[PDB]
Amino acid sequence: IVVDPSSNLYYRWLTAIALPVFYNWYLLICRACFDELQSEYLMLWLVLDYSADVLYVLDVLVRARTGFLEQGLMVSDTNRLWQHYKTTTQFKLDVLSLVPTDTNYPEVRFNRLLKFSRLFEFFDRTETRTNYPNMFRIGNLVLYILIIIHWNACIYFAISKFIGFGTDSWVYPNISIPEHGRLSRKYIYSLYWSTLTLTTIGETPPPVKDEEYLFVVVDFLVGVLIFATIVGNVGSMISNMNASRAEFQAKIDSIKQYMQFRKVTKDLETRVIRWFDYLWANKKTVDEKEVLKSLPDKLKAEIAINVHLDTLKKVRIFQDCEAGLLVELVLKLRPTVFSPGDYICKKGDIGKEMYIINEGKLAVVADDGVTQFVVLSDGSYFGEISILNIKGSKSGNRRTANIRSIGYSDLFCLSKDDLMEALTEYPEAKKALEEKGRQILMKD
């Protein structure tokens, strides 16, 4: 059996193996530095370390049987997979993170930290997988900040133990005292000093000896570099979060300043601002071409027939004229958004647009009298006789009605040439639509 790297069994395995790598990092530097946590809960840490080593054995056994892409298809030959895992440095790392060195010195198990690529791959898969990527980036950086804070707390306690407890004013105090002697106080005051040094706050006791001066200089330099990276990345991510709305409001006040300068009257100004308010309120700010230019025509056609074919399939002779030509039409259609009371067409105008109504309600009104001839809900179509314009007709070359908007309608336009070069490969569809347009145009 071969597991797929893009599957979900592999991701559940990534979670069940990115638990003990994180355990190894966090609690192994803590067990190696504090040394009462190790020699107190010895059976607990031995059970957890044996479980971590068995999970690493299964990690090597899974990476020696995972699949990879070669010439498009999933390669599943076991000998080729063994060789392809053997040739990479990750196999050397997974072998170096397995040698069973370990009692009272758990520093000998630091070779289990060499499998950091697994935790990084788990973080990367969850970032590209979950539906909250910015909050997961916040969580990833907060976990990195906490790991670095915990590691410098452990390093401050180790430097204090190596120099001598309670000797200077900078080191951890004398450990024989029962107030500074418990492990909770040990770890919590080491975390307090670690965060008040790595934050560059400095409400901590100043150093005395030269090795303490050197460690505190190096620690504030690491603190300012880490905190500069954190501030910069959080500012960049907040800017990425708000960029869309910022450029939208940029476009808004740009067109506002334009019309205010070019002296457009207040009713048209207020209608444009109301249209932009409606656009933001119903979330149609993105453009279809600008969002799906990159996707290929096959997937664009899948989304097109998922969105508009259910609305197009209810008109008369369009019951599967030809599948490829219906695909071409639902790809080459183009959206538009209208305002209430806006005339789609006047009298005495050339027609070059077929409009389909979809989530909208237009109306056919007379010229002088505001009247309701017939209302048209979604799925209806209009424009056909003026797009066709076949020889032998009345041949006005004009739109013979007033299709007026009732509310905030939303049509999906289709130009005459985007009809023509769509149907150019199959002229029998043109012949059928020509006869239907001819009969409605000649019976009037």
Ligand X SMILES: *[C@@H]1O[C@H](CO)[C@@H](O)[C@H](O)[C@H]1NC(C)=O
With CB under 5 to 8 Å by kind, the binding choice for 164 among ligand PCG, another protein, a copy of itself, none is none
Q: Quote the tokens at residue 247.
A: 């450029």
In this structure, the number of other CB atoms found within 10 A of the CB of residue 18 comes to 19
Site string for a copy of itself, 117-136 (x = CB under 8 A): -----------xx---x---
- The residue among 175 and 252 lying less far from ligand X, judged by its C-beta, is 175
Interface region with ligand X, contact rule CB under 6 A, candidates 99-107, 172-180, 309-317, 396-404: 172-180
With CB under 5 to 8 Å by kind, the binding choice for 401 among ligand PCG, ligand X, another protein, none is ligand PCG
Beta bridge partners of 382: 355
Using the rule CB under 6 A, is 395 a contact of ligand X? no
Q: Are 129 and 12 in contact (CB under 8 A)?
A: no
Q: Are 74 and 67 in contact (CB under 8 A)?
A: yes
Interface with a copy of itself (CB under 8 A), residue total: 126
Query: 121 CB contacts (<8 Å, ≥6 apart)?
Result: 14, 18
Cβ at position 304, least distance to a copy of itself in Å: 10
Residues 172-201 that bind a copy of itself (CB under 8 A): 184-185, 188-189, 191-192, 195-196, 199-201
Interface region with another protein, contact rule CB under 8 A, candidates 13-21, 55-63, 297-305, 380-388: 297-305
| DSSP per-residue letters across 81-148 | HHHHHHTSHHHHHHHHT--------GGGGGGGGG-HHHHHHHHHHHHHHSS-HHHHHHHHHHHHHHHH
Residues 366-425 that bind ligand PCG (CB under 6 A): 373-374, 382-386, 399-401, 403
Backbone angles phi, psi at 154, to 5 degrees: -65, -40
- Candidates 76, 167, 339, 389; binder of another protein (CB under 8 A) is 339
- Candidates 47, 69, 96, 177; binder of another protein (CB under 8 A) is 69
Q: Are 291 and 318 in contact (CB under 8 A)?
A: no
Which residues participate in the annotated binding site for 3',5'-cyclic GMP? 383-384, 386, 399-400, 444
Phi/psi class of residue 200: alpha, beta or left (left: φ > 0; alpha: ψ in -120 to 50)?
left
Binding residues (CB under 6 A) for ligand PCG: these are 345, 351, 364, 373-374, 382-386, 399-401, 403, 444
